[model samples]
Target chain A: TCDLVGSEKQLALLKRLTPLFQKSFESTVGQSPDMYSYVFRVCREAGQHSSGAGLVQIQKSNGKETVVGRFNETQIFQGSNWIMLIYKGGDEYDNHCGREQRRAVVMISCNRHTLADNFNPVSEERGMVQDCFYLFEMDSSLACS
Target chain B: EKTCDLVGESEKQLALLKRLTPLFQKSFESTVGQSPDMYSYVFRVCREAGQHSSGAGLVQIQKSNGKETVVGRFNETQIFQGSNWIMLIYKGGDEYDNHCGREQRRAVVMISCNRHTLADNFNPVSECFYLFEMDSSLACS
Candidate 1:
């Protein structure tokens, strides 16, 4: 189980997201050289149905960019101030088949002042998977700066 | 067995930071030597600063290179957020010891968006910037 403190309301929200894990979407919305990137995805019918999938693969080489990652069993939990998403999968470089998987968590937020309804304002994410940690911002609208 | 050292803010702490910057910006002013839309604001909020800012706590830093430990509670300012197309101008703060010692320091961490994004295709360019008279003892415990 993930270990992070939150309000009771926040914990409840996280529990509700468990079922949606197997059915979701993901994308590499942002990235930096060896530091980070933004990966965002959602469910086809998150609250309505099941059996969905999404993937975000981003790679950086000698100043070049490539896509090489995978996400599955994705879980998304939102707090009053932030959005947290976790999944059971590893990068393409890993040699595990869902049995010995690495956990990936992505959290997103923005300038609080700019957000009127900040409940689900996740524009990116940062977390660890396969012993590697990264930061990525969400751009559901695909907006870049 | 060489494992990649982990450092910097966690996704959770960063989420808190994502929620904190705007409040910091409320009192933010463009420094004389820096660009208005591009700069880093630094300060010390607390240890678990990520959880209870209620709308405070502007920044967080984690030692990324040397000690490979997660450390934050300091302030850093960002003008905007993109994958790799953003600019960073860090003014003085209680600063960390990852790059420079605990003394105050100033620096610019800039990046150009990779050629694949809309921002880059629209205006192909390079990410360029610099820093001066900084406390080069930027490492952490």
Candidate 2:
């Protein structure tokens, strides 16, 4: 189970999303040279084993995956029919700008038609080896409640 | 009275939004290097800060041709607290350069908390996916 603290209402949302974390979901909405794509999972770790922690911002052309954010410190919240999961403070990369932690945002909207569908990438910047992140959106029936 | 309705439904997150909203009125610009690869970035919070009324929250303007590319818009915004810094994301902007395979440009703004000034050293970390850094008192934890 995903271990974290939240309001009763927020926890309720987590309960709904728990069943779907069996495997990581992939999104290729935006593809770049430094980034091949991204894979995401809730509570559990995802990505390559080296830096394959949680919320692995997958890389290729630049090199293998490097930074990975943890799930323990993840921030979770929900609205009437949407849930926003944020992972931060992941492995930091030393860039010309300095060391900065990697981050990712998974925006889930409620969709009763299917439990979880329409998962795809949105936008990403910092496509180099540092200061980068992945923004993705997915629809899950669990979020409707 | 700015409100984060769809998100930030939690107590702590709501309070954080209140603290960071005062930056709505201010806009910061940074021009780096010389012509050719030179770019002028227009950044703001909760407002459109681009040129010629494009309504882009963040824009990368090529100084060579005075070309403007909207990386993110002000209407669809997501704000949350991250460690000691505040994270503000702007979505639903005009598609910029189209370098990245993604559509609908977006921006990830990391505002570090500090009382040094309203904001300073605000500039692009470096495009299709824009990452920005700014220090602001309102974002202070």
Query: Residue by residue across B1-141, what tens digits does model 2's lDDT show?
Result: 333332213455456556767777777888887857999988877667776645577887888987887877766666655333566787776654444665777777767656678777687653444667777777655
Model 2 stretches with alpha carbons more than 4 Å out = A1-145, B1-15, B96-98
- By TM-score, how accurate is candidate 2? 0.48
lDDT of 2 at B89: 80
**Model 1 ranges with Cα > 4 A deviation:** A1-39, A44-53, A58-72, A95-102, A110-131, A139-145, B1-141
- lDDT measured at residue B21 in model 1 versus the true structure, 0 to 100: 38
The best candidate by TM-score is 2
Docking class of 1: incorrect
Q: What lDDT tens digits, residue by residue, belong to model 2 across residues A1-145?
A: 4545345655665676778878678754334554555667887877666343556655656646644466766667654445667777667766633467766667676678988877665544343232244556677877665
What is the Cα root-mean-square deviation between model 2 and the actual structure? 17.5
TM-score per candidate? 0.28, 0.48
RMSD of 1: 16.8
TM-score between candidate 1 chain A and the true chain A: 0.36
Could you give the DockQ of candidate 2? 0.03
Q: How accurate is candidate 2 locally (lDDT)?
A: 0.64
